[PDB]
Design an enzyme around this catalytic site. Sequence first.
Site, PDB file in Angstrom:
ATOM      1  N   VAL A  27      18.527  48.178  27.690  1.00 49.37           N
ATOM      2  CA  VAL A  27      17.434  48.595  28.380  1.00 49.37           C
ATOM      3  C   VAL A  27      16.207  48.556  27.083  1.00 49.37           C
ATOM      4  O   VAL A  27      16.835  48.445  25.813  1.00 49.37           O
ATOM      5  CB  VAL A  27      17.522  49.631  28.704  1.00 49.37           C
ATOM      6  CG1 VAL A  27      18.432  49.826  30.110  1.00 49.37           C
ATOM      7  CG2 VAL A  27      18.329  50.841  27.910  1.00 49.37           C
ATOM      8  N   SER A  29      14.308  46.609  25.584  1.00 50.10           N
ATOM      9  CA  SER A  29      13.489  45.874  24.942  1.00 50.10           C
ATOM     10  C   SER A  29      13.656  46.101  23.698  1.00 50.10           C
ATOM     11  O   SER A  29      12.444  45.645  23.033  1.00 50.10           O
ATOM     12  CB  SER A  29      12.228  45.292  25.472  1.00 50.10           C
ATOM     13  OG  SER A  29      12.806  45.081  26.330  1.00 50.10           O
ATOM     14  N   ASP A 165      12.729  61.567  19.781  1.00 45.43           N
ATOM     15  CA  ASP A 165      12.977  61.142  18.748  1.00 45.43           C
ATOM     16  C   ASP A 165      11.776  62.813  17.750  1.00 45.43           C
ATOM     17  O   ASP A 165      10.882  62.200  16.937  1.00 45.43           O
ATOM     18  CB  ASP A 165      11.865  59.822  18.675  1.00 45.43           C
ATOM     19  CG  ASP A 165      12.450  58.668  18.703  1.00 45.43           C
ATOM     20  OD1 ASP A 165      14.433  58.572  19.107  1.00 45.43           O
ATOM     21  OD2 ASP A 165      12.367  57.502  18.539  1.00 45.43           O
TER      22      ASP A 165
HETATM   23  C1  LIG Z   1      17.226  62.936  17.517  1.00 42.86           C
HETATM   24  C2  LIG Z   1      15.906  62.967  18.458  1.00 42.86           C
HETATM   25  N1  LIG Z   1      16.834  61.316  19.432  1.00 42.86           N
HETATM   26  C3  LIG Z   1      16.342  60.987  20.085  1.00 42.86           C
HETATM   27  O1  LIG Z   1      16.039  61.289  21.075  1.00 42.86           O
HETATM   28  N2  LIG Z   1      17.139  60.161  19.976  1.00 42.86           N
HETATM   29  C4  LIG Z   1      17.160  58.748  21.412  1.00 42.86           C
HETATM   30  C5  LIG Z   1      18.791  58.242  21.442  1.00 42.86           C
HETATM   31  C6  LIG Z   1      19.593  58.019  21.085  1.00 42.86           C
HETATM   32  C7  LIG Z   1      20.710  57.721  22.180  1.00 42.86           C
HETATM   33  C8  LIG Z   1      20.856  56.682  22.635  1.00 42.86           C
HETATM   34  C9  LIG Z   1      19.427  56.247  23.019  1.00 42.86           C
HETATM   35  C10 LIG Z   1      18.414  56.895  23.144  1.00 42.86           C
HETATM   36  S1  LIG Z   1      16.899  56.250  23.482  1.00 42.86           S
HETATM   37  C11 LIG Z   1      16.474  56.879  24.943  1.00 42.86           C
HETATM   38  C12 LIG Z   1      17.326  58.179  25.446  1.00 42.86           C
HETATM   39  C13 LIG Z   1      17.113  58.257  27.042  1.00 42.86           C
HETATM   40  C14 LIG Z   1      16.788  57.758  28.099  1.00 42.86           C
HETATM   41  N3  LIG Z   1      16.180  57.421  29.033  1.00 42.86           N
HETATM   42  N4  LIG Z   1      15.603  56.450  29.484  1.00 42.86           N
HETATM   43  C15 LIG Z   1      14.808  55.827  28.353  1.00 42.86           C
HETATM   44  C16 LIG Z   1      13.771  54.957  28.003  1.00 42.86           C
HETATM   45  C17 LIG Z   1      14.312  53.300  28.261  1.00 42.86           C
HETATM   46  C18 LIG Z   1      12.540  55.057  28.833  1.00 42.86           C
HETATM   47  N5  LIG Z   1      15.968  56.267  27.044  1.00 42.86           N
HETATM   48  C19 LIG Z   1      16.174  55.761  25.779  1.00 42.86           C
END
Ligand SMILES: CCNC(=O)NCc1ccccc1Sc1ccc2nnc(C(C)C)n2c1
Length: 351
Positions: A27, A29, A165
């Site tokens: 997911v 891209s 983030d």
């Molecule tokens: C320290 C702060 N770190 C983060 O926020 N990292 C983001 C992250 C961690 C683990 C797995 C994926 C991600 S990015 C993410 C997380 C949830 C989510 N729900 N929708 C989306 C996108 C596809 C719109 N997500 C992206």
Amino acid sequence: ERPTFYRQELNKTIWEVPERYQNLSPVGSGAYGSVCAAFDTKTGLRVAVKKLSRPFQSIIHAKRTYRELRLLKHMKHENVIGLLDVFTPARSLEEFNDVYLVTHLMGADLNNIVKCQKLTDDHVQFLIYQILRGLKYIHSADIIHRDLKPSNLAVNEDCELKILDFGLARHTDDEMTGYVATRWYRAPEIMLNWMHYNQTVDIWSVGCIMAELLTGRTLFPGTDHIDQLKLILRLVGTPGAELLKKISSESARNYIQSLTQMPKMNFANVFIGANPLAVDLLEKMLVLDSDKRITAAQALAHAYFAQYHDPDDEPVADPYDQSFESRDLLIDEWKSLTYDEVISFVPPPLD
Ligand SMILES: CCNC(=O)NCc1ccccc1Sc1ccc2nnc(C(C)C)n2c1
């Protein structure tokens, strides 16, 4: 006990994950890195699983892996992305190589909802309320986002929002040159390195986002750093005597003073027809002097949010120990710290 892991090839990478996570599909891209949507059979949730790329390639990258894991483990708030799970196929530190981070999948970001469109005041209310509620929590742990923008806001079908983030160095890798969204939400003091900034840089970003949700247009779509500063000062005016004293960069202060002075514009004339309470909140957010901006806590108590505001359902964070940030360690030392953090993880409860 150790769950049973299974392997598969995704994005030319091998994904070895526990059996509970099924139907893995890439997911975003590559926008969020090596992330897969998956179905978690144990919780029934749709999750986002990130396989960290080159987690221990350097001291900076080892520290980056540790920082992310630490930050994600600390966050336990509805409007902030947290850690549902963390795993490694490795049975010992000696075989430790890969980190997999698991969180809720919202499915879309703030742009993938409100593209070029000016939404109803009620949607903007709920969307900004959630950003402010989560930011109050992040700021209570003495963490600064520094990269708050719509692409960092995870939104579901029901308009529920989680902040992504926060507190990372990762945004410093981003291209900040030209007509780019990665710079449009940045406070002028962070964008032009005016001083050692604080958490109020994030309130500036909320203001940029709120105005764009209200009008359907980017507030400061500068073609470069200079053009963006001119867009900023046309609206909020040029700095006065007091702020100029606070701009610790002699070079920045010297350039600011070369510009023809401008008064702050009338926000009611800029934001035509918008809720007067929304305009009032925007004036308190888009203050050039960071010290004079409204805080997330104060903005939650603003009249614009009366239908959502509840001071007993806007929690603060537990103490966040950031002392590791000033620590000089070797790759192996950051790596061992991470392994300890992976191994010690306690999952959230399942109702
Ligand atoms: C320290 C702060 N770190 C983060 O926020 N990292 C983001 C992250 C961690 C683990 C797995 C994926 C991600 S990015 C993410 C997380 C949830 C989510 N729900 N929708 C989306 C996108 C596809 C719109 N997500 C992206």
